[PDB]
Design a protein around this ligand. Sequence first.
Ligand SMILES: *[C@@H]1O[C@H](CO)[C@@H](O[C@@H]2O[C@H](CO)[C@@H](O[C@@H]3O[C@H](CO)[C@@H](O)[C@H](O)[C@H]3NC(C)=O)[C@H](O)[C@H]2NC(C)=O)[C@H](O)[C@H]1NC(C)=O
Ligand SMILES: *[C@@H]1O[C@H](CO)[C@@H](O[C@@H]2O[C@H](CO)[C@@H](O[C@@H]3O[C@H](CO)[C@@H](O)[C@H](O)[C@H]3NC(C)=O)[C@H](O)[C@H]2NC(C)=O)[C@H](O)[C@H]1NC(C)=O
Ligand SMILES: *[C@@H]1O[C@H](CO)[C@@H](O)[C@H](O)[C@H]1NC(C)=O
Ligand SMILES: *[C@@H]1O[C@H](CO)[C@@H](O)[C@H](O)[C@H]1NC(C)=O
Lengths: 48, 412, 444
Amino acid sequence: STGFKISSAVACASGVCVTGSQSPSTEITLKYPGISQSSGGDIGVHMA
Amino acid sequence: PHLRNRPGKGHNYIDGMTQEDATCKPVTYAGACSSFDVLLEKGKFPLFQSYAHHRTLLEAVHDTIIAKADPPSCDLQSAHGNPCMKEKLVMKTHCPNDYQSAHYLNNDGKMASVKCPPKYELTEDCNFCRQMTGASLKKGSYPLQDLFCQSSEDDGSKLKTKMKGVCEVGVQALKKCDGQLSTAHEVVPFAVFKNSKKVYLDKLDLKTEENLLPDSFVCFEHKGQYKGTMDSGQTKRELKSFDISQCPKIGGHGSKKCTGDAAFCSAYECTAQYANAYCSHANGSGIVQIQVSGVWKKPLCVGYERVVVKRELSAKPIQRVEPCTTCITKCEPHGLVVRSTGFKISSAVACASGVCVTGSQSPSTEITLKYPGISQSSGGDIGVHMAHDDQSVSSKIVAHCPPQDPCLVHGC
Amino acid sequence: CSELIQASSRITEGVNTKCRLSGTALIRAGSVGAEACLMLKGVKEDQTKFLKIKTVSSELSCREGQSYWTGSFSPKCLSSRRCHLVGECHVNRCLSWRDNETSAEFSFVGESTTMRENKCFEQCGGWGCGCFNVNPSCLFVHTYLQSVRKEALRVFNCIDWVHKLTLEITDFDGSVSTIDLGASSSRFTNWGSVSLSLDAEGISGSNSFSFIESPGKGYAIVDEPFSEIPRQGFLGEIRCNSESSVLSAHESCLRAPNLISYKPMIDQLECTTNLIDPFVVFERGSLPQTRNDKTFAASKGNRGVQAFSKGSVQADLTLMFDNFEVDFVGAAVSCDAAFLNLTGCYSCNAGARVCLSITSTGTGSLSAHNKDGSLHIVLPSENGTKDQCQILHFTVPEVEEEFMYSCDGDERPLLVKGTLIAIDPFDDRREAGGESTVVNPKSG
Ligand SMILES: *[C@@H]1O[C@H](CO)[C@@H](O[C@@H]2O[C@H](CO)[C@@H](O[C@@H]3O[C@H](CO)[C@@H](O)[C@H](O)[C@H]3NC(C)=O)[C@H](O)[C@H]2NC(C)=O)[C@H](O)[C@H]1NC(C)=O
Ligand SMILES: *[C@@H]1O[C@H](CO)[C@@H](O[C@@H]2O[C@H](CO)[C@@H](O[C@@H]3O[C@H](CO)[C@@H](O)[C@H](O)[C@H]3NC(C)=O)[C@H](O)[C@H]2NC(C)=O)[C@H](O)[C@H]1NC(C)=O
Ligand SMILES: *[C@@H]1O[C@H](CO)[C@@H](O)[C@H](O)[C@H]1NC(C)=O
Ligand SMILES: *[C@@H]1O[C@H](CO)[C@@H](O)[C@H](O)[C@H]1NC(C)=O
């Protein structure tokens, strides 16, 4: 995230979601939700 | 008594009964009208008393909002042998004494009325005329229904009664039903729209929105007021009605100076000179919209009635017949085994001449149980009661087995 | 996948003779993103109507308890100083002044609905002060609160969380149906009703935080216990029962004792107070926050809050009186299908994704069944060529099977290839499972 820092975030892909928590930073990494990593597709992200 | 400043003409009189034109032609603060003062009695006509600044049925009729039915009022003196008294006989009303006439809104959405022969009065149920010697009948007609009307242009030709579980409400035959018919008297709200008939409603969801049209303002004047109508010495402090059509609109022309409150000054042009009348904004007026089929509409009239409704309680409460036999029961030396085709069995019990044996397991198409008592040695018939996951399956079955040999059971 | 033989009806040529199928169905609900299948078998190469129950998502919704409203308020004070023995400047009246009693000087206020209080303070008495009398004078102060911003915040708490399942009802000849329902609850849809058991867990405990809602702006979480009594220096020191009361500073609002600070210095009085800005606290704790591995967030559609926690549930939904049949479906239709690919895992709640290219001349479905009948594939067929996808379950690293596919017509073979990835559990004893699992946080 350019500028604003991200502390906690969540990623949803066809029902299954995965969360992540970290110190406020310009970037954040999360585990892939379900088989979206294998199947690709579109994944929604909601972050604070 | 601000409620006597009627919107529009305010003609609260009916054709034929024109002996009270002194006070029933435009209703004002001064006189008394028999066909209007009943509406303002406490505890009676609460729906209109809430919407007190909307037109009545007679006012709506005289403003051409609501039409007059064919034979507008078939007099019982001359038409008592005609099928007239039909929509009235399905309503449960209550008239006071000394009333020779009573008006109502018929099924077609027009105004009809019942008029007794001269010197007769309507009884307490408004169904019969009776004569009392030396009685002074009132000069007006009793409003039978509790309703208020308004002017609307919204079309309602596609509007119809949609009541669930009702075979017939009032004089309308909703559908054809056979069997039980719970018939009773119920209070049904109803509405009348443009180019339609009466529409009974299951629910009354209505809202009002305000505006600045002339019907939303109450304009009055004082009696004995300087430079006004009736400019002469008075012995009492009384008010007088004023016509808002004279006060000029904002940026327009008019014939009388006119002052008022904030809403009037925003809508009309308030004068800077000595004014001729005071125009307040209507306590409750506006436009009332009724929610029908989930969409708002503008009704001509809204009220409620006490009519006879026929309902259907039920066609069938519940049907519970389950002669299911989709399982195979076979007694085995290892144990009593039943395989249930389809539905799974979690827990079961077996009865054999008093003694019973239970068994519990995960839901599965089959279950095995220990033999009850000496039924394994003696064979016979053993009852089984099991709990299925599905429904419509008999839970009581019987298994017939011949005597068994325990040697295979305990063989080792 | 599931028949209705005990309640099947003759669904004459062409016309429909459905007899209002009353037999209920007891089938296990699919996992998140999976589907539940029904079989309505009539005449071969005819009928074959499929009712599908898509499992959209499972959320741990909140059951709100008490609630209130709050906003930003600032005070305004009117002062009037009178010498001794003037008006009610008697000392006995001066100390015993009730806070709810208005002085005669501020009668232009008259009757008002605003939150207000009245105080009386003694001052100097003497010619230096300004009054010939030497007894102490009086200063009457009338203070009223007014709202600064034209917004309000609603503060509530979640007494408990309830499991809540969203279903997409692909009905016969039309899939315009989406429903949402909770534990041991039924919804009166078309063709009868749909009930959900969800016998595993109907609740997921409680909490001791508070939640803020800004209408049209979202939600937030504050890390304080929900207090029903106002407290100075906390949130909800001034609380009301509606947004209008907050925006109008109505007198019905409750507040703590001693919020207003008075500075009766001899030149002019200073009426001021320090108040926790609820908007600052709302912006501080916007919803996507994780507390002890719970990760509360906004529910889809922003109608509430969720709670992502580790866990799973068992759902067994039941149909009843399912009857939706017409006559025009008597005609047959042919398609053409082409296997596309296979991805996903095995023995996993996520499952394996299959995709199929359907080349069909019109509306229809697909009923591919494997040799043993264990696995079923259903996909709608439309005019032209389309690419549909489905979710299945497997227990093998490599998938190589043949299915008997036919859309209300001639039976044809379809061969599926592909392998499946292995999910690393970092700890395995027997197996993973295939039940309905709720969303969980990473730290769980
Ligand atoms: C296995 O086959 C699948 C089926 O084709 C592929 O999954 C999806 O295929 C869709 C088309 O067949 C793609 O739809 C496109 O999506 C993008 C945005 O994602 C849209 O802009 C396009 O309009 C839409 N349609 C077309 C014709 O492009 C899906 O994107 C796609 N899903 C993905 C890529 O995750 C798989 O891609 C395929 N996998 C492998 C490994 O071959
Ligand atoms: C030891 O002798 C007993 C006495 O005969 C047998 O026990 C019962 O004998 C009855 C007849 O004598 C049987 O009655 C029949 O039951 C079936 C259903 O069970 C009915 O349909 C018949 O109408 C009825 N009558 C006749 C004439 O068939 C009993 O069934 C039977 N009890 C059983 C078999 O458990 C014993 O069978 C017998 N045992 C041995 C090892 O020889
Ligand atoms: C003096 O005048 C005040 C009013 O300013 C009055 O309230 C008070 O009672 C008076 N005191 C007397 C008459 O002793
Ligand atoms: C509020 O004021 C009224 C009249 O001023 C008084 O009767 C009542 O006791 C007051 N309430 C209090 C002091 O709690």
